[PDB]
Amino acid sequence: TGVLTESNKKFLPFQQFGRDIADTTDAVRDPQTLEILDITPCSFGGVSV
Amino acid sequence: AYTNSFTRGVYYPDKVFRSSVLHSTQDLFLPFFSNVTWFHAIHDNPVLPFNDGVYFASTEKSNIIRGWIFGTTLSLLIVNNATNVVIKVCEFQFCNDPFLGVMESEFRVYSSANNCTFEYVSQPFLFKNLREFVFKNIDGYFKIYSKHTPILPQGFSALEPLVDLPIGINITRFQTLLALHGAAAYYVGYLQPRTFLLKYNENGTITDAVDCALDPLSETKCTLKSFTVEKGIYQTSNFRVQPTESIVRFPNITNLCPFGEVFNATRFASVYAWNRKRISNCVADYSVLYNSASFSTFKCYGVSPTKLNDLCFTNVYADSFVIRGDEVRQIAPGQTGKIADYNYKLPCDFTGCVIAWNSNNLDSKVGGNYNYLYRLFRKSNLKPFERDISTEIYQAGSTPCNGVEGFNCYFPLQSYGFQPTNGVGYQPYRVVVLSFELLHAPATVCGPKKSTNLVKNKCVNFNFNGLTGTGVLTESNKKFLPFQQFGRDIADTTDAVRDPQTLEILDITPCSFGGVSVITPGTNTSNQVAVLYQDVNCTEVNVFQTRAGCLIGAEHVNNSYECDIPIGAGICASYQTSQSIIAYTMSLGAENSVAYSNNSIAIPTNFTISVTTEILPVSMTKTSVDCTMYICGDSTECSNLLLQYGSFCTQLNRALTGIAVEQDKNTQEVFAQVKQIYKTPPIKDFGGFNFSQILPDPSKPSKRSFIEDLLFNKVTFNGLTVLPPLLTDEMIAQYTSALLAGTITSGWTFGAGAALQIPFAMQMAYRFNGIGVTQNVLYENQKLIANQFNSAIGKIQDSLSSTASALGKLQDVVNQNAQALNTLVKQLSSNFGAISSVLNDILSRLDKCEAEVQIDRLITGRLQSLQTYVTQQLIRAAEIRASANLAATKMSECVLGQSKRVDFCGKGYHLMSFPQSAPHGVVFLHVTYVPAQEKNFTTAPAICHDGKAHFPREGVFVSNGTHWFVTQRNFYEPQIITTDNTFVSGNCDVVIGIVNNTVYDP
Amino acid sequence: FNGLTVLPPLLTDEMIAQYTSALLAGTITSGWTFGAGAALQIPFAMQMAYRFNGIGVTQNVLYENQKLIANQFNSAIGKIQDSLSSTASALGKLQDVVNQNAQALNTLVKQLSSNFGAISSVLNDILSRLDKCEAEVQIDRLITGRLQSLQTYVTQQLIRAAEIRASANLAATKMSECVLGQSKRVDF
Amino acid sequence: CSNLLLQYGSFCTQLNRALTGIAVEQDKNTQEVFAQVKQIYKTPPIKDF
Amino acid sequence: LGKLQDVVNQNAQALNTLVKQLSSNFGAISSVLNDILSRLDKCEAEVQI
Ligand SMILES: C=CC1=C(C)/C(=C/c2[nH]c(/C=C3N=C(/C=C4\NC(=O)C(C)=C4C=C)C(C)=C\3CCC(=O)O)c(CCC(=O)O)c2C)NC1=O
Ligand SMILES: *[C@@H]1O[C@H](CO)[C@@H](O[C@@H]2O[C@H](CO)[C@@H](O)[C@H](O)[C@H]2NC(C)=O)[C@H](O)[C@H]1NC(C)=O
Ligand SMILES: *[C@@H]1O[C@H](CO)[C@@H](O[C@@H]2O[C@H](CO)[C@@H](O)[C@H](O)[C@H]2NC(C)=O)[C@H](O)[C@H]1NC(C)=O
Ligand SMILES: *[C@@H]1O[C@H](CO)[C@@H](O[C@@H]2O[C@H](CO)[C@@H](O)[C@H](O)[C@H]2NC(C)=O)[C@H](O)[C@H]1NC(C)=O
Ligand SMILES: *[C@@H]1O[C@H](CO)[C@@H](O)[C@H](O)[C@H]1NC(C)=O
Ligand SMILES: *[C@@H]1O[C@H](CO)[C@@H](O)[C@H](O)[C@H]1NC(C)=O
Ligand SMILES: *[C@@H]1O[C@H](CO)[C@@H](O)[C@H](O)[C@H]1NC(C)=O
Ligand SMILES: *[C@@H]1O[C@H](CO)[C@@H](O)[C@H](O)[C@H]1NC(C)=O
Ligand SMILES: *[C@@H]1O[C@H](CO)[C@@H](O)[C@H](O)[C@H]1NC(C)=O
Ligand SMILES: *[C@@H]1O[C@H](CO)[C@@H](O)[C@H](O)[C@H]1NC(C)=O
Ligand SMILES: *[C@@H]1O[C@H](CO)[C@@H](O)[C@H](O)[C@H]1NC(C)=O
Ligand SMILES: *[C@@H]1O[C@H](CO)[C@@H](O)[C@H](O)[C@H]1NC(C)=O
Ligand SMILES: *[C@@H]1O[C@H](CO)[C@@H](O)[C@H](O)[C@H]1NC(C)=O
Ligand SMILES: *[C@@H]1O[C@H](CO)[C@@H](O)[C@H](O)[C@H]1NC(C)=O
């Protein structure tokens, strides 16, 4: 679950999905069309009164 | 021939994009700096066995190589003819001369193809260029990686993947095919299991690697997960002596255990009185029973039957009986039913196993066999392993029938009617249960495996009557009593054992282990290292033995210096001069012996103004983490499973919130000591002193001083968040500027009440008075003092514009927090024994009832990681609060006043202090008075003038050899001895050391 | 010897003795001057007069009673010897520390003798009795509990180390203020 | 057993790190207490105090 | 007097939490021991316990 964005990462033609230093699935290549999409978690955060 | 692999043959191990990451992998690889075999074969073919994978690099110009062959004995026949790829899997016939054409005029790869299994043809395609290749296979996959680059040359080159066409055969043997009509060069490497550390750049390409099981420096890099290691000692691994061989030592008995008589018996007792045969003091063969197919079920609790032949049991109990057919599974631990509670109860902790076989032949007879009886009613359940033999009728009601059969008074024993006519669900079954009990005693029953001779003074794998262990055996001196068998330690460790065969006592000790640490200078300096094998004699591994262990790679030096790297026990190592690593005993400092005498004093005639820096952490980052996003990322059923653990998460959040509030409190109590924001005047007539480097300058948008700017440039989404500090850095800068303005323009008066102006030189005179120096000393040297101060300030700038390590106290704090957080995130990638570390995968693969088991296993461990993190943060926050309280005390005492406490506000007599803000901390510039060039003088405690004794009011009586003066203690300012700077007390016959001299009187 | 080891301190006891002897020599022969800069010699009785001045007593009082004072000092020192050659409880503050650490370690070892619900506390017995698939269940049950014992031990050690650091900072402050100088702080 | 331990993550690395920090802290404590003096002073042979 | 009051509150808070954790199943069938012991026989009861 997350928000998908057009990326600028230079995936090598064999690479499929990227990962973060935190071992998080940062980016994914779409199977159908060969483009790279950055995944980011859609915004969360505490609410204080 | 041979040559060297200068860091060649590293590939992308997987199709994952990683950018600017230092990632550690562990798989088949070519070790760095290895013997890669050079071939220049002319024009059957060479045979180069597939051990685990092959590296192949050729600066091709002709490619007379024509084919790859894999198999066990020789069947994979792969051929790249430089235009297409042809794979065959057929049991080919290898020819007398295995080769093919260079075009093709031969068919000598094989004569025919029969019972073919696979075939494939790929697409058609067509010393300057080096072509590197890697061929391996993993569990069916046959992977080829490649790299084709223009130019073994040194440097670096990553290998991209290529076609994987899995087959999955047993490959023990490899050939590269030759051909028959010049020669070229091709190098053959050999992969092996290996751990690497790969450095991806911002484009995602590997640019460098570390073969970290190569040499100690690389191990250090791999433990630190960095390509650069600073000077120091790093504990990198654990050395331990491997056992050389295995020792099996069992008693000398050979009488086989009587198993036939409790299996082939014509009679088995009825279940209500199961018959218990004992087995002890014999050799039991459990393979014959398990391998026999005569048994319907053979199922074992606490043991695996296939290993039963390798165990030693103190006692065995074979309890035999017969039961009805599909009651067979009532004979099991923790089972309920009619016979499992009334007739035969096993313990929950039942070690041993159950054997059942159908017997519809000798236990069944036409007309019914009524000898096989079982109790059906009892007043209570049966305890584990108790037999109840009785015939009293069951008083189902309250009637004391006392042995008469009627209503509510039933006979408890009911008999099966066993016939061959009965079906499978009724027909009798013969059952025997073997109850062992395991090692708490000298074993009696042991398997059929044979003993062996023992060895001593060598680490081995010993096995004494099933007592397994690893260690070194030694002849002992312990006085075992003749019934005692094995000793034990205060730590409940098996210290000693008596050999079953020969009656002697052997001490067991664990063969030596211990950490191994890497002494290195900074890799920026050099790459030589030493290694310290801790607490181990190095007859077990120049070489130098010391109290900490054995140090190799470092030479011993008799000359003592100050420490550079602590080994331990008085030993430090350093990189010195050719250059090498030396190890030495620490010199505690320059030997000194001050020339004490009972009438000699030493007084300074000058001084220095020294500015030192003390850097103190004050706060740390206000992080906050919520469970139900960290533990259970937006999974509602995971949250439901979390709710039943209680209020762990509420209290974790509360603890972290308390820490976060505490940080703001720390900053408040340190910096917000001043009530009003004071401002320095536009004029800077501070008596020649120069504060331009510490006062704010309006030239910058941020109103930080020069030194604050230097300091700020010297230190650098899973439910985690970082709350901003309440006080922004500009507010901290304003507080520090206010403190500086108050200190400069008002002195210490602004800390007690309203800020009272005073010229700077006057508060300076005050402060010199405060250290026992008369104020004239300042006014007569004011310019000099100012210059010294300014110079000191300048040096501080230099010492902060060159060396970044001075701020380390702050940097470490930051690093520590970051370290913890990184760990907290990586624990989200751990299974904790579950099937996966990803919650959604578990939820998509499984249904609810087993999914929740795995999810519970994950929660138990993610929660634990959180608790660990929060506990560490609480302790670190207590440490930071201590440091902040110290900083507040220093601000109150060193800045807002003048402290007489020694070495509290710097080394020397404290004059003053300046605060400077730093990221998550504070820097005090302690200005101190340090005495300088001194002279010996003759002295005397008192002076006799007219019989009466004269003592100095403040100061000491000194003499330059002829005349006696009185001088202040911390600065040579002799004055004529007079009845005003001295006072009189008594006569001159009691003071020990008094001297004769006149005393002037106006 | 279950993976535990005790690293030697960097400073050997002889080096500590050398440091203390150096501090004593500086205090005796130079006063507090060696803590501020170069050690400036001064006769002992003169720094004694200085220190009496430091408590609001004029220095004549010393020179007119010097012998007496010396005797008292010596007598006090003698009594200290006696009070340290008879009663061992005076050192208890140190002894307790040692005991505590040892106590923890003993506990850490005895937790290796606990099943934690497994069939045995010995790993090799589990591995020899069972096949892999149930053996790993028991081994996981053991690891979960040995790891917990380690975490408990390390947390206790961290807290105790914070306490010891507080005491050491106090000791450093006392060395700086009481030895290297003369403190006006009361009962410090 | 070590393979079964590997799947609990980096608990053990951080435990070792914590104990190492304690051990270094002890030497630091001793340094800051006793190594306040810079030179090793020696008392004179005479004891006329 | 809040500095003192907070201390008291904190301790009380902890104790209250310590008691409420006696009402948690921790994945068992019940948070009450006697209910587990009355509903089940020994061999599965000890698992829940
Ligand atoms: C042997 C198996 C074999 C492999 C694995 C292989 C892979 C391979 N070789 C390539 C280029 C190429 N490959 C070759 C020939 C060779 N390169 C070699 O490693 C060898 C052994 C030869 C044959 C002697 C040439 C001439 C090019 C084009 C080079 C150019 O641009 O001029 C390419 C790039 C194709 C493209 O343009 O997209 C691939 C994928 N070619 C092969 O023949
Ligand atoms: C006290 O020390 C200062 C420096 O520490 C002396 O000042 C220096 O004097 C020399 C003359 O020999 C000059 O060349 C330097 O430029 C001076 N330095 C500064 C910073 O002014 C001073 O002379 C000394 N006083 C006595 C009485 O010896
Ligand atoms: C206070 O000291 C600073 C140096 O840190 C002086 O600034 C220098 O001033 C001279 C001329 O006076 C310039 O040539 C330099 O370029 C300045 N340096 C910097 C870094 O700014 C400043 O002048 C001094 N103040 C007084 C009143 O003399
Ligand atoms: C000790 O100090 C006295 C006091 O100044 C010195 O006596 C003076 O010496 C100078 C030159 O020697 C004469 O110009 C003065 O007239 C002397 N003053 C008096 C009052 O006699 C004496 O020389 C110094 N001695 C030593 C060894 O330094
Ligand atoms: C079929 O696959 C091709 C491959 O690129 C893709 O472009 C196309 O959109 C796909 N069509 C459908 C209907 O999935
Ligand atoms: C090849 O290996 C042997 C032993 O492993 C070694 O002695 C030899 O130096 C190696 N060859 C080269 C060229 O380094
Ligand atoms: C690789 O990194 C460099 C770094 O400046 C960049 O200029 C370039 O666009 C990146 N991509 C390629 C294909 O070189
Ligand atoms: C048989 O047992 C005796 C008992 O002491 C022992 O001395 C002897 O070595 C044993 N022999 C064999 C072959 O095990
Ligand atoms: C007697 O028992 C042994 C071992 O249980 C078995 O191998 C053998 O077959 C039995 N005898 C018969 C006649 O089945
Ligand atoms: C190391 O081994 C030697 C071998 O004789 C022995 O003498 C020595 O005591 C052992 N222990 C050390 C050097 O600490
Ligand atoms: C160092 O001192 C030892 C004394 O045991 C002596 O044997 C050795 O030769 C000395 N080495 C040097 C380089 O002076
Ligand atoms: C004081 O006298 C002693 C012994 O004569 C000498 O070693 C020392 O250097 C003298 N002091 C100075 C400052 O020269
Ligand atoms: C100590 O002082 C006395 C007289 O004050 C003197 O006789 C003696 O020589 C001095 N001590 C030394 C070591 O010179
Ligand atoms: C000091 O002078 C008195 C009388 O003037 C004399 O008795 C005494 O011996 C003298 N002492 C010294 C040390 O010169």
- Concatenating the DSSP letter of every residue in B220-286 gives HHHHHT-S---SEEEEEEEEEPPP-EEEEE--S--PBP--GGGTS-S---BGGG-EEEEE-SEE---
Q: Is the CB of B2 under 6 A from ligand 6?
A: yes
Cα Rg of chain B (Å, integer):
44
Could you tell me which residues come within 8 angstroms of residue B216 by beta carbon, excluding any fewer than 6 positions away? B236, B516, B518, B529, B531
Subunit contact C151:D11, Cβ cutoff 8 A: yes
Please answer whether residues B952 and B638 qualify as being in contact, where contact means their C-beta atoms are separated by less than 8 angstroms: no
Q: What residue has token string 């290297």? A: C180
d(CA B662, CA B660): 5
CATH number, domain containing residue B207? 2.60.120.960
Sign of CA dihedral B317, B318, B324, B326: positive
Ligand 1 pocket: which of B66, B81, B125, B164 to mutate (most atoms <8 Å of CB)? B125
Nearest residue (CA) to ligand 2, atom 26? B606
Residues forming a β-bridge with B531 = B518, B552
> Residue D46 to residues B93, B104, B599, B888: CA-CA distances in angstroms?
102, 105, 13, 46
Residue B239, strand partner residues: B514
What is the DSSP secondary-structure string of B778-801? HHTTHHHHHHHHHHHHHHHHHHHH
Contact B625/B720 with Cβ under 8 angstroms? yes
DSSP string for B173-203:
EEEE--B---B--EEEEE-EEEEEEEEE-TT
The set of residues, in sequence order, having a beta carbon less than 8 Å from that of E4 and lying 6+ positions away, is: none
Among B452, B465, B501, B502, name the best residue to mutate to test ligand 8's pocket (greatest count of ligand atoms within 8 A of Cβ): B501
Distance from B711 to chain A by nearest Cα, in Å? 28
The single-letter code of the amino acid at A8 is N
DSSP string, A8-47: -----TT--EEE-TTS---EEE-SSS--EEEEEPPP----
Q: Which resolution, in Å, applies to this structure? A: 3.0
Kindly determine whether residue C45 and residue B992, on different chains, have CB atoms separated by under 8 Å: yes
Q: How far apart are the first and last CA of chain B?
A: 107
CB B72 within 8 Å of CB B173: yes
- Residue C93 distance to chain D (closest CA, Å): 17
Q: Among positive and negative, which fits the CA dihedral C146, C151, C152, C157?
A: positive
d(CA B518, CA B533): 9
Chain D residues touching residue B872 (CB < 8 angstroms): 18
Taking the C-alpha atoms of residue C40 and residue C55, their distance in angstroms, rounded to an integer, is 22
Q: Which residues of A touch B718 (CB under 8 A)?
A: 22, 24
Cα B384 from Cα B437, distance rounded (Å): 14
Neighboring chain A residues of B829 at a CB cutoff of 8 Å = 23
SS3 B312: strand
- What is the C-alpha separation between B842 and B858, in angstroms, rounded? 10
Whole-angstrom CA distances from B810 to B50, B328, B616, B619 are 54, 71, 7, 10
CA–CA min distance A34, chain B (Å): 15
CB B329 within 8 A of CB B335: yes
Cα(C19) to centroid of ligand 11, in Å? 26
C-alpha distances (whole Å) from B273 to each of B53, B318, B378, B724 are 65, 14, 14, 78
CA angle B573, B578, B580 (to 5 degrees): 20
* Minimal Cβ distance to D39: which of B590, B832, B865: B590
CA nearest ligand 3 atom 21, residue: B692
Looking at the partner chain, which of B595, B832, B865 has a beta carbon nearest the beta carbon of D7? B832
* Alpha carbon of residue E2 to chain centroid: 30
The answer to whether the Cβ–Cβ distance between B18 and A18 falls below 8 Å is yes
| SS3 at position B976 | strand
- Residue B823 has φ and ψ, to the nearest 5°, of -60, -45
- Closest CA relative to residue B603, chosen from B950, B995, B938, B999: B938
Angstrom CA distances, B634 to A42, B631, B718, B839, C25, stand at: 12, 9, 11, 10, 69
Per DSSP, the residues of C116-163 read TTSS-S-HHHHHHHS-HHHHHHHHHHHHHHHHHHHHHHHHHHHHHHHH
Ligand nearest to the CA of A32: 5
**Closest to B953 in 3D by CA, of B942, B940, B945:** B942
- The C-alpha of C95 sits at a distance from chain B's nearest C-alpha, in angstroms, of 21
Instruction: Tell me, in angstroms, the distance from the centre of ligand 5 to residue A33's CA.
Output: 7
Shortest distance between the Cα of B568 and any Cα of chain D, in A, equals 10
Measure the CA dihedral C165/C167/C171/C174, to 10°.
120
Distance CA B126, CA B651 (A): 69
- Tell me how far apart the alpha carbons of residues B117 and B92 are, in angstroms, rounded to a whole number: 11
Partners of E42 on chain B (C-beta within 8 Å) are 334, 348
Burial class from Cβ neighbours inside 10 Å (0-12, 13-18, 19+) for residue B2 reads exposed
Q: What are phi and psi of B90, to 5 degrees?
A: -145, 155
B362: left (phi over 0), alpha (psi -120 to 50) or beta: alpha
- CB neighbours of E24 closer than 8 A, spacing ≥ 6? B644, B645, B646, E31
Q: What gap in Å lies between CA B168 and CA B198, rounded to an integer?
A: 29
Residue with tokens 């740390």: B620
Identity at E9, one-letter amino acid code: N
Tell me, using a 6 A CB cutoff, whether residue B993 lines ligand 13.
Answer: yes
**Domain range for B59:** 2-240
Ligand with smallest separation from the Cα of A31: 5
Alpha carbon nearest to ligand 3 atom 22, residue: B692
Convert B810-855 into a string of H (helix), E (strand) and C (coil): HHHHHHHHHHHHHHHHHHHHCCCCCCCCCHHHHHHHCCHHHHHHHH
Q: Is B249 within 8 Å of B462 (Cβ atoms)?
A: yes
Local structure of residue B30 (DSSP, 8 states): P
Residue B543 φ then ψ, to 5°: -120, 130
Ligand 12-lining residues (CB < 6 angstroms): B 595, 934-936
Nearest chain B residue to C44 by CA distance is B598
User: Which uninterrupted H or E stretch holds B83?
Assistant: none
Residue B77 DSSP class: E
Q: With a 6 A CB cut-off, is B501 part of the ligand 8 pocket?
A: yes
Quote the CA–CA distance of B443 and B466 in Å, as a whole number: 8
Nearest to C40 by CA among C55, C57, C54, C28: C28
The ligand with the least distance to the CA atom of B560 is 11
Determine, for residues B510 and C1 on separate chains, whether the beta-carbon distance falls below 8 Å: yes
Measured between alpha carbons, how far is residue B301 from residues B312, B440, C135, E49 in Å?
A: 16, 19, 12, 21
What are the tokens at B5? 């692999």
B821 CB-near residues (< 8 Å, 6+ apart): B623, B720
**One-letter-per-residue 3-state SS of B909-957:** EEEEEEEEEECCEEEEEEEEEEECCEEEEEEECCEECCCEEEEECCCEE
Is the Cβ–Cβ distance between B353 and B305 less than 8 Å?
yes
The Cα angle at residue B434 between residues B432 and B438, in degrees rounded to 5: 175
Name the packing angle between helices B808-826 and B848-890 (round to 10°). 170
CB of B943 within 8 A of CB of B976? no
Q: Which residues line ligand 1 (CB under 6 A)?
A: B 60, 63, 80, 82, 125-126, 131, 146, 148, 162
Tokens 């013997």 belong to B35
For residue B145, the ligand closest to its alpha carbon is 1
Q: Report d(CA C108, CA C175) in Å as an integer.
A: 36
Residues 6+ apart with CB under 8 A from B946: none
Judge whether B478 and B488 are in contact, CB under 8 Å: no
Cα-flanking dihedrals φ and ψ of residue B111, to 5°?
-85, -30
Smallest CA-to-CA distance from B741 within B670, B681, B671, B673 is with B681
CA gap B571, B534 in Å, rounded: 13
